[PDB]
Design an enzyme around this catalytic site. Structure first.
Site, mmCIF file in Angstrom:
data_model
loop_
_atom_site.group_PDB
_atom_site.id
_atom_site.type_symbol
_atom_site.label_atom_id
_atom_site.label_comp_id
_atom_site.label_asym_id
_atom_site.label_seq_id
_atom_site.Cartn_x
_atom_site.Cartn_y
_atom_site.Cartn_z
ATOM 1 N N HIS A 6 -0.221 -5.758 0.805
ATOM 2 C CA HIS A 6 0.086 -4.445 1.367
ATOM 3 C C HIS A 6 -0.226 -4.413 2.846
ATOM 4 O O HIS A 6 -1.322 -4.004 3.229
ATOM 5 C CB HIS A 6 -0.735 -3.395 0.612
ATOM 6 C CG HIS A 6 -0.426 -1.973 0.995
ATOM 7 N ND1 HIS A 6 -0.911 -1.408 2.108
ATOM 8 C CD2 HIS A 6 0.300 -0.975 0.325
ATOM 9 C CE1 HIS A 6 -0.492 -0.124 2.168
ATOM 10 N NE2 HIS A 6 0.255 0.130 1.080
ATOM 11 N N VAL A 54 -2.762 -3.542 5.726
ATOM 12 C CA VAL A 54 -3.320 -2.218 5.955
ATOM 13 C C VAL A 54 -3.778 -1.634 4.617
ATOM 14 O O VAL A 54 -3.127 -1.817 3.586
ATOM 15 C CB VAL A 54 -2.297 -1.289 6.630
ATOM 16 C CG1 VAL A 54 -1.049 -1.144 5.771
ATOM 17 C CG2 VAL A 54 -2.920 0.076 6.912
ATOM 18 N N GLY A 68 -3.314 3.991 1.553
ATOM 19 C CA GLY A 68 -3.849 5.350 1.611
ATOM 20 C C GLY A 68 -4.221 5.868 0.226
ATOM 21 O O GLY A 68 -5.237 6.537 0.068
ATOM 22 N N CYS A 69 -3.434 5.511 -0.776
ATOM 23 C CA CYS A 69 -3.682 5.960 -2.133
ATOM 24 C C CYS A 69 -5.038 5.525 -2.672
ATOM 25 O O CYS A 69 -5.637 6.231 -3.469
ATOM 26 C CB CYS A 69 -2.555 5.502 -3.070
ATOM 27 S SG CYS A 69 -2.564 3.740 -3.479
ATOM 28 N N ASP A 79 -8.092 7.645 -3.765
ATOM 29 C CA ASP A 79 -8.730 7.446 -5.055
ATOM 30 C C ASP A 79 -10.236 7.356 -4.966
ATOM 31 O O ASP A 79 -10.936 7.808 -5.857
ATOM 32 C CB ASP A 79 -8.192 6.238 -5.802
ATOM 33 C CG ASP A 79 -8.383 6.389 -7.289
ATOM 34 O OD1 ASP A 79 -7.851 7.388 -7.830
ATOM 35 O OD2 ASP A 79 -9.073 5.568 -7.914
#
Lengths: 170, 170
Positions: B69, B75, B78-79, B83
């Site tokens: 990713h 990077v 964001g998820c 979480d």
């Protein structure tokens, strides 16, 4: 924008930068990739008449997240279903022919009201493009839902993804 | 509600069901676990006077998500930062002594306005408990931010996590 459905192999090609070209939108590779196939993508139709995507993830008990989330209580992380939706909105922007790398920018409201267990067969994503904006940065706003074997379980309103070219930064 | 900081070993114990006991809140195990340590947890103080958590994740270039990713453009997803926030809110509910298994229920607005690169040193999470409700189901509502090396990069308002003494109806 000629092609309206994509196989897993096409998505893996996309994750290598080989579908939209280097410096353009990329799906994550496994194990962050949360989509097996895109069964429909279009720039017309959908809930707002501005396009839609329907995509699928096949579920089996050996998917990596089940073992660690949680021990003795396997369940798909909501955050990954949500990420599938960002992945799809990013893919949409690349598919339209826009340049630049994808970054999720957030969401308006997210709701988890069901779960994906390892005994499920198939998760389906339905994404409705609400708006694309081409001002300083190219971005898309969308609503989405996640369903498992016919039943809606997650929703997100105002999903936002932007594309960043070499001249724009975060 | 007696211990106010937790080591990685304590969090790994929690992921095995061995901190709060079987059938009670569990963190995910690696590689879904997004917290190395909880440096502060309390049921007083915070932005709303109803408690807060401060937690950390150490960053190095070999973290698994960087490789996939994205290829050529590492990077943090964001998820996963998002979480971490649901993980911490769930942990808070278990830490209070409530029974049942944790399920993230969603969020009001989520914003990503920066990134964690593999050259970063440390991500810090700040969670402010806004409300806990014990009426039908036990649940917590919280706001959170993610920062990297001093700089705020993600925010979430109205994070919601519930505890389920049985998950058969979710």
């Amino acid at each position: 924008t000629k092609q309206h459905a994509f196989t897993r192999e096409d998505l893996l090609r996309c994750s290598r930068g080989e579908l939209f070209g280097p410096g353009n939108a990329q799906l994550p590779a496994p194990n962050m990739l949360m989509i097996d196939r895109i069964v429909h993508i279009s720039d017309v139709g959908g809930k707002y008449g501005k396009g839609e995507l329907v995509a699928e993830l096949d579920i089996n008990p050996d998917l990596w997240f089940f073992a660690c989330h949680f021990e003795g209580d396997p369940v798909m992380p909501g955050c990954l279903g949500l990420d599938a939706m960002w992945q799809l909105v990013g893919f949409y922007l690349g598919w339209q022919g826009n340049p630049g790398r994808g970054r999720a920018l957030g969401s308006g409201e997210v709701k988890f009201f069901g779960q994906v267990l390892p005994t499920a067969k198939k998760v389906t994503y339905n994404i409705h493009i609400k708006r694309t904006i081409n001002r300083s940065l190219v971005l898309a706003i969308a609503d989405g839902t996640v369903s498992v074997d016919g039943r809606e379980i997650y929703s997100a309103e105002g999903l936002r993804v932007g594309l960043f070219t070499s001249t724009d930064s975060f």
